[PDB]
Amino acid sequence: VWKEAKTTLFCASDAKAYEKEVHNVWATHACVPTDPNPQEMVLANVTENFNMWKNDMVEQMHEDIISLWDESLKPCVKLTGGSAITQACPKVSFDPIPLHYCAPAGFAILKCNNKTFNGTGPCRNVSTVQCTHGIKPVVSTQLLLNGSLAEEEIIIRSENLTNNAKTIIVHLNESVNIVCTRPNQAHCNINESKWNNTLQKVGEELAKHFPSKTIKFEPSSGGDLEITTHSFNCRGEFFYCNTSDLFNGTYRNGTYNHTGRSSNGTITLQCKIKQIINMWQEVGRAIYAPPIEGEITCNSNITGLLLLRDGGQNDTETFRPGGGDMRDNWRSELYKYKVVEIK
Amino acid sequence: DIQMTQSPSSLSASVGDTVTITCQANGYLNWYQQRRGKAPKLLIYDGSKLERGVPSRFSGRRWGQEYNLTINNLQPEDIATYFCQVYEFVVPGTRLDLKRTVAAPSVFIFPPSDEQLKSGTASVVCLLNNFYPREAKVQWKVDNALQSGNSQESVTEQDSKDSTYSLSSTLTLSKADYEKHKVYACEVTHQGLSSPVTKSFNR
Amino acid sequence: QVQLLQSGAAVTKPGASVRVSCEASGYNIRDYFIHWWRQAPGQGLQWVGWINPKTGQPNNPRQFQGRVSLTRHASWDFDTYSFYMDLKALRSDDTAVYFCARQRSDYWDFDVWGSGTQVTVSSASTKGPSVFPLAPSSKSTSTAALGCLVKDYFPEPVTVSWNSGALTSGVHTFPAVLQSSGLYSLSSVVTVPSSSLGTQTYICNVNHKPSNTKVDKKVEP
Ligand SMILES: *[C@@H]1O[C@H](CO)[C@@H](O)[C@H](O)[C@H]1NC(C)=O
Ligand SMILES: *[C@@H]1O[C@H](CO)[C@@H](O)[C@H](O)[C@H]1NC(C)=O
Ligand SMILES: *[C@@H]1O[C@H](CO)[C@@H](O)[C@H](O)[C@H]1NC(C)=O
Ligand SMILES: *[C@@H]1O[C@H](CO)[C@@H](O)[C@H](O)[C@H]1NC(C)=O
Ligand SMILES: *[C@@H]1O[C@H](CO)[C@@H](O)[C@H](O)[C@H]1NC(C)=O
Ligand SMILES: *[C@@H]1O[C@H](CO)[C@@H](O)[C@H](O)[C@H]1NC(C)=O
Ligand SMILES: *[C@@H]1O[C@H](CO)[C@@H](O)[C@H](O)[C@H]1NC(C)=O
Ligand SMILES: *[C@@H]1O[C@H](CO)[C@@H](O)[C@H](O)[C@H]1NC(C)=O
Ligand SMILES: *[C@@H]1O[C@H](CO)[C@@H](O)[C@H](O)[C@H]1NC(C)=O
Ligand SMILES: *[C@@H]1O[C@H](CO)[C@@H](O)[C@H](O)[C@H]1NC(C)=O
Ligand SMILES: *[C@@H]1O[C@H](CO)[C@@H](O)[C@H](O)[C@H]1NC(C)=O
């Protein structure tokens, strides 16, 4: 009664047209208010196939957020190799709002129900919602500052585990808190006790598909500062937190040992607000004004990892933090969805 | 954990011959051709799919973990090493040789010159002239003792005249170590020999 | 038209560093990873690692992690990409030819390769060759073979001619092999008639143009 197809999806939102922040501003002249009562036509005994790495919905979400950052958080001077531009660079409120994405009439979004679904292959339990659940679009490398969590066991996501060129996405089960501040040279704060427990159980799942090997965690192997260093954006400020002591441990025999230089039972990552930024959206460099005066703090809860396995021959797989392409972030949320035409 | 093996190592055929090589693998396999001292050339990808611009006489069949590469009607321009590749892993490959009659190598051995002894170094050169196939085994023996880790050997290319090869091994050691022994031998093994042949000399 | 242009042959002393470039052009460069391979004499291709053009993210095996760093440099309209491979602490077995290649698809098929650059790790500066005679002390039939020995020179190459170019029949010049001392060494032998000794003058002509060294040598037992 249905087949797979492509459609120009529209976004649903619970935003407000009276807010200062550029997210509510955008999500009103670009999105349609929520239902908020969608129908859950859930039925069993029907199997469907999904693929989070070749999914059409991801590219559309990538497009709208691109227009968001471009017209919202405006820089001072951009460089496009042979053609620069100068404009006004006003500071503004910057806090993401959870968004939805819906299919028009004649089309339908299929939803998997197997909470242990990795991201590719068939799925026994299917349902149909006209839209998608509340999803917060957070741009962040290495770590996923905000997202959902599976109440079930930890799931590993990759287009191919055998392919070391494919970025690995780790969907956790328990939330891990992260606090990045700028008192009146910044820094993050992560609870080592929780962090040790998380990487303990991550290794158990990594040693499932790679049993014989001892799992490791080394810092990034190099590249731009945006990818090597865990970069994000709090209230419009481009933070770059040194992660060299965050990913510095070893997992063997069902136990994980972290180095990490924890000077007070808490992981401290030296952050720094930059003004020269390699743009993730368009190819070029964008310059910004110095931070705001006062406190700059946002309490985040990392729900996922972005890792890349090193290739070669030693019965010991080392994993370094990755990312770069912001599509992967939204694949870890849209993994359970797919566009399907009713006709 | 990717396991890949390729057979055979040595291979010989004439012009217009139909040739086949096999490579056991558990992943995406690609076939390559590499001429001497040059970059590898892609031929077959995904075990079957033919690369554009590549002669149609090349072909590959995929089933299970067994991968074949087939070259119908061999050509002189096809004499090169062929290696199969899965992801990060590359097998040494199969060397394609211009087929000829099995021939025994003419073994020679040359004692170190006096001028070199002045320098404090001594080099003994064993010679394997005009032979086929390429596969040969040269072991150095000093006072009935096998030498390991002090000998280098260079092999010439297949001649367009007689289609044979030449091998020159060189035992390198100090004059101090050269003047502690007497008999210097040179054992050579080849498919064209009834038994290993030794050529020695004394001081 | 997609072409990957690598740098010229580089000779570096051990311990020091070397840089191997690879000018990529003629395609949608950002959408394809660039991998590196090295080729020691004979053996098989060795994976050095890949690099993400847009990101700059490298991926090296543990045997290279620390000594190698893969970087890139864009152009004006991005029609030219410069992929740099830096190898910090060079050792003896780092001497090889490195190949800049392009990952076309997820099948890991490499359709476009560079010509390659000869990286020779040695600290021999520039020296002429030492010519040593090869002759049979004891006459046991041996149908007879003799030659010369080109020893301890740098760098390549050495042209070897017999009897000022007269003798070409049965002449075999062997490819030079790089010794552990950081000096090249080859040998050239010729098959001579058994009765030719004494009634024939055998002279080899070793030429080393880099160090401007040409030596004539006469060999007889
Ligand atoms: C299908 O999945 C839903 C959760 O999304 C669950 O409530 C329901 O029990 C599942 N159906 C069956 C038969 O297990
Ligand atoms: C997902 O499950 C299928 C089998 O149902 C398996 O082939 C595939 O490798 C899995 N994907 C991941 C990301 O592990
Ligand atoms: C985390 O996942 C492990 C996998 O077995 C599970 O045992 C544990 O209960 C989970 N903890 C959480 C997040 O509740
Ligand atoms: C790390 O976390 C695990 C799981 O919570 C815990 O059992 C273990 O004691 C911790 N390891 C160390 C040595 O602190
Ligand atoms: C993540 O979500 C938390 C809770 O709503 C919020 O306080 C925080 O600002 C978010 N992190 C960022 C910077 O996106
Ligand atoms: C992060 O900090 C570590 C420790 O000082 C340093 O070695 C590393 O270079 C830093 N990373 C970057 C790329 O700034
Ligand atoms: C785990 O490690 C301990 C030593 O710490 C060893 O005694 C035990 O055999 C190991 N168990 C397994 C199954 O690896
Ligand atoms: C791992 O952490 C320790 C403690 O900070 C540090 O000394 C070491 O250099 C780190 N290793 C890296 C950078 O991979
Ligand atoms: C972090 O996530 C957990 C999930 O249970 C939530 O309880 C907590 O309020 C979050 N912290 C904040 C304030 O973002
Ligand atoms: C991943 O790649 C391997 C390469 O052999 C292939 O066998 C496997 O089917 C791939 N997994 C999928 C279906 O994505
Ligand atoms: C591969 O070729 C061999 C002969 O060389 C043949 O025996 C075998 O059937 C072939 N494998 C397949 C499955 O095509």
Cβ partners under 8 Å of residue B149, min gap 6: none
Distance CA C184, CA A18 (A): 79
- Nearest-CA distance A311 → chain B (Å): 7
Q: Give the CATH number of the domain where residue B49 resides.
A: 2.60.40.10
The answer to whether A302 touches A176, Cβ cutoff 8 Å, is: yes
Q: Is B7 in the pocket of ligand 11 (CB under 6 A)?
A: no
If you take atom 4 of ligand 2, which residue's CA is the nearest one? A121
Distance CA A229, CA A193 (A): 23
Q: Looking at the structure, do residues B123 and B201 belong to the same domain, yes or no? A: yes
B10 contacts chain C (CB < 8 A): no
Distance CA A128, CA A142 (A): 32
Under 8 Å CB pairs connecting chains A and B tally to 11
Asked, as a colleague might, if the bond just before A36 is cis with ω within 30 of 0, I would say: yes
What is the structure's resolution, reported in angstroms to one decimal?
3.0
List C-alpha distances in Å: C217 to A84, A207, B111, C163, C207.
69, 67, 17, 10, 11
The answer to whether C98 touches C38, Cβ cutoff 8 Å, is: yes
Query: In chain A, which residues have their Cβ closer than 8 Å to the Cβ of B1?
Result: 210, 212
* Touching subunits for chain C (3+ Cβ pairs under 8 A): A, B
- A314, two tokens: 């030693």
- For residue C10, the tally of other CB atoms under 10 A from its CB is 14
- B69, two tokens: 């590469």
Cβ partners under 8 Å of residue C143, min gap 6: B106, C191, C193, C194
* Touching subunits for chain B (3+ Cβ pairs under 8 A): A, C
Distance CA A7, CA A23 (A): 24
Asked, as a colleague might, if the bond just before C210 is cis with ω within 30 of 0, I would say: no
Write out the H or E segment, with its range, that includes residue C215: strand C213-218
Q: Please, what is the Cα angle at A99 between A95 and A103, to 5 degrees?
A: 160
Q: Looking at the structure, do residues B76 and B171 belong to the same domain, yes or no? A: no
The answer to whether B30 touches B85, Cβ cutoff 8 Å, is: yes
Q: Looking at the structure, do residues B85 and B106 belong to the same domain, yes or no? A: no
Distance CA A222, CA A235 (A): 27
Distance CA A339, CA A7 (A): 8
A47 contacts chain B (CB < 8 A): no
DSSP annotation of C64: T
Distance CA B150, CA B153 (A): 10
C185: exposed, middle or buried (C-beta count within 10 Å: 0-12, 13-18, 19+)? buried
Q: Is A297 in the pocket of ligand 9 (CB under 6 A)?
A: no
Distance CA C221, CA C198 (A): 10
A164 contacts chain B (CB < 8 A): yes
Q: Looking at the structure, do residues B41 and B96 belong to the same domain, yes or no? A: yes
Report the Cα B106 to chain-centroid distance in Å: 18
CATH architecture of residue range(s) C124-221: Sandwich (2.60)
- For residue B54, the tally of other CB atoms under 10 A from its CB is 15
Chain breaks in chain C (C to N over 2.5 A) after: 142
Centre of ligand 9 to C-alpha A197, Å, is 17
Q: Is A44 in the pocket of ligand 1 (CB under 6 A)?
A: yes
Phi-psi category of A78—alpha, beta or left, where left has phi over 0 and alpha has psi -120 to 50? beta
- A214, two tokens: 């001892």
- Which of B84, B100, B116 terminates a domain? The answer is B100
- C192, two tokens: 């001579």
- C221, two tokens: 């037992």
Distance CA A66, CA A281 (A): 6
Domains of chain A, CATH where assigned: 1-343 (2.170.40.20)
- Nearest-CA distance C114 → chain A (Å): 21
Query: In chain A, which residues have their Cβ closer than 8 Å to the Cβ of B87?
Result: 162-164, 311
Distance CA C52, CA C73 (A): 12
Distance CA B89, CA B1 (A): 10
Q: Looking at the structure, do residues B56 and B10 belong to the same domain, yes or no? A: yes
Query: Residue A164 and residue B1: Cβ atoms within 8 Å?
Result: no
Query: In chain B, which residues have their Cβ closer than 8 Å to the Cβ of A311?
Result: 87-88
If you take atom 4 of ligand 3, which residue's CA is the nearest one? A153
Q: Nearest residue on chain A to C65, judged by CA atoms?
A: A221
Query: Residue A311 and residue B27: Cβ atoms within 8 Å?
Result: no
- Which of B100, B131, B153 terminates a domain? The answer is B100
Cα pseudo-dihedral C119, C121, C123, C128, rounded to 10: -60
Distance CA C172, CA B110 (A): 16
Cβ partners under 8 Å of residue C30, min gap 6: A283, C53, C54, C78
Among A162, A163, A166, A213, most B C-beta atoms within 10 A, so best to mutate, is: A162
- C124, two tokens: 């021999």
Burial C114-126 (b: 16+ CB within 10 A, else e): bebbebbbbebee
**Domain boundaries defined on chain C:** 1-123, 124-221
- C144, two tokens: 């007879």
DSSP-assigned letters across all residues of chain B:
---EEEE-SEEEE-TT--EEEEEEESS-EEEEEE-TTS--EEEEETTTEEPTTS-TTEEEEEETTEEEEEESS--GGG-SEEEEEETTEE---EEEEE----B--EEEEEPPPHHHHHHTEEEEEEEEEEEBSS--EEEEEESS-EE-SSEEEEEPPPPSSS--EEEEEEEEEEHHHHTT---EEEEEE-TT-SS-EE--B--
List C-alpha distances in Å: A218 to A198, A201, A309, A322, C62.
16, 17, 10, 11, 11
In this chain, the answer to whether the domains covering C1-123 and C124-221 adopt an identical fold is: yes
Cα pseudo-dihedral C50, C52, C55, C58, rounded to 10: 0
The answer to whether A171 touches A154, Cβ cutoff 8 Å, is: yes
- The residues that bridge with B170 in the sheet, in sequence order, are B125, B152
The answer to whether C71 touches C2, Cβ cutoff 8 Å, is: no
CA end-to-end span of chain B: 54
Distance CA C178, CA C209 (A): 18
Report the Cα A343 to chain-centroid distance in Å: 34
Query: In chain A, which residues have their Cβ closer than 8 Å to the Cβ of C47?
Result: 311-312
Place of tokens 């093994």: B189
Q: Looking at the structure, do residues B202 and B149 belong to the same domain, yes or no? A: yes
- Number of folded domains that form chain B: 2
Q: Looking at the structure, do residues B6 and B95 belong to the same domain, yes or no? A: yes
Centre of ligand 7 to C-alpha A207, Å, is 14
- For residue A275, the tally of other CB atoms under 10 A from its CB is 15
Ligand nearest the Cα atom of residue A158: 2
C86 contacts chain A (CB < 8 A): no
Which of A45, A11, A14 has its CA nearest to residue A31?
A11
Cβ partners under 8 Å of residue B77, min gap 6: none
DSSP annotation of A17: T
Q: Looking at the structure, do residues B111 and B81 belong to the same domain, yes or no? A: no
**Elucidation technique:** X-ray
Distance CA A308, CA C71 (A): 17
Ligand nearest the Cα atom of residue A148: 9
- The residues that bridge with A287 in the sheet, in sequence order, are A77, A276
Cα pseudo-dihedral B47, B50, B56, B62, rounded to 10: 20
- B40, two tokens: 């590898």
Compare CB distances from C172 to B46, B123, B156 and report the shortest one's residue.
B156
- Nearest-CA distance B145 → chain C (Å): 23
Report the Cα C169 to chain-centroid distance in Å: 28
Q: Which of residues 30-69 of B touch C (CB under 8 A)?
A: 30, 38-42, 45-46, 51
Which of C110, C111, C134, C143 has its CA nearest to residue C189?
C134
Distance CA B164, CA B99 (A): 10
- Which of B61, B81, B100 terminates a domain? The answer is B100
Q: Looking at the structure, do residues B8 and B66 belong to the same domain, yes or no? A: yes
- The residues that bridge with C208 in the sheet, in sequence order, are C213
Q: Looking at the structure, do residues B23 and B114 belong to the same domain, yes or no? A: no
DSSP-assigned letters across all residues of A29-62:
SS-EE--S------BSS--EEEETTS-HHHHHHH
B170: exposed, middle or buried (C-beta count within 10 Å: 0-12, 13-18, 19+)? buried
Query: In chain B, which residues have their Cβ closer than 8 Å to the Cβ of C43?
Result: 92
The answer to whether A312 touches B88, Cβ cutoff 8 Å, is: yes
**CATH dotted code for C1-123:** 2.60.40.10
Distance CA B20, CA A246 (A): 52
C158 contacts chain B (CB < 8 A): no
Scanning A246-340, the segments in alpha helix (DSSP H) are: 327-331
List C-alpha distances in Å: B133 to B97, B103, C93.
8, 7, 29
Burial B62-83 (b: 16+ CB within 10 A, else e): eeeeebbbebeebeeebbbbbb
Which of B178, B141, B136, B174 has its CA nearest to residue B154?
B136
Report the Cα A54 to chain-centroid distance in Å: 17
DSSP-assigned letters across all residues of C92-119:
GGG-EEEEEEEE-STT--EEEE---EEE
Distance CA A308, CA A318 (A): 9
Distance CA C171, CA B130 (A): 11
Classified as helix, coil or strand, C156 is coil
Distance CA A150, CA A242 (A): 28
Ligand nearest the Cα atom of residue A162: 10
Asked, as a colleague might, if the bond just before A90 is cis with ω within 30 of 0, I would say: no
List C-alpha distances in Å: B142 to A102, B118, B120, B122, B177.
83, 21, 18, 13, 11
Place of tokens 């997609």: C2
Cβ partners under 8 Å of residue A272, min gap 6: A185, A186, A239, A240, A241, A242
- C189, two tokens: 């032998």
Place of tokens 């694949």: A331
Q: Looking at the structure, do residues B115 and B96 belong to the same domain, yes or no? A: no
Distance CA B130, CA B192 (A): 12
- Nearest-CA distance B87 → chain A (Å): 7
Name the residue type at position B126.
C
Q: Looking at the structure, do residues B151 and B107 belong to the same domain, yes or no? A: yes
- Nearest-CA distance C33 → chain A (Å): 9
Identify the domain containing residue B114 by its residue range: 102-203
- For residue A21, the tally of other CB atoms under 10 A from its CB is 19
Name the residue type at position C52.
N
Using DSSP bridges, classify how beta strands A10-13 and A32-33 pair: parallel, antiparallel or unpaired.
Answer: parallel
Q: Please, what is the Cα angle at A218 between A212 and A221, to 5 degrees?
A: 115
Query: Residue C132 and residue B116: Cβ atoms within 8 Å?
Result: yes
Classified as helix, coil or strand, A310 is coil
B127 contacts chain C (CB < 8 A): yes
Query: Residue B154 and residue C47: Cβ atoms within 8 Å?
Result: no
The answer to whether A315 touches A212, Cβ cutoff 8 Å, is: yes
Write out the H or E segment, with its range, that includes residue A22: helix A22-26
Distance CA B102, CA B95 (A): 17
The answer to whether C48 touches C64, Cβ cutoff 8 Å, is: yes
Which of A114, A125, A93 has its CA nearest to residue A23?
A93
Q: Please, what is the Cα angle at A213 between A209 and A214, to 5 degrees?
A: 115
Distance CA C91, CA C169 (A): 41
Query: Residue A324 and residue C103: Cβ atoms within 8 Å?
Result: no
The answer to whether B19 touches B70, Cβ cutoff 8 Å, is: yes
- A88, two tokens: 């006004």
C135 contacts chain B (CB < 8 A): yes
Distance CA B62, CA B57 (A): 17
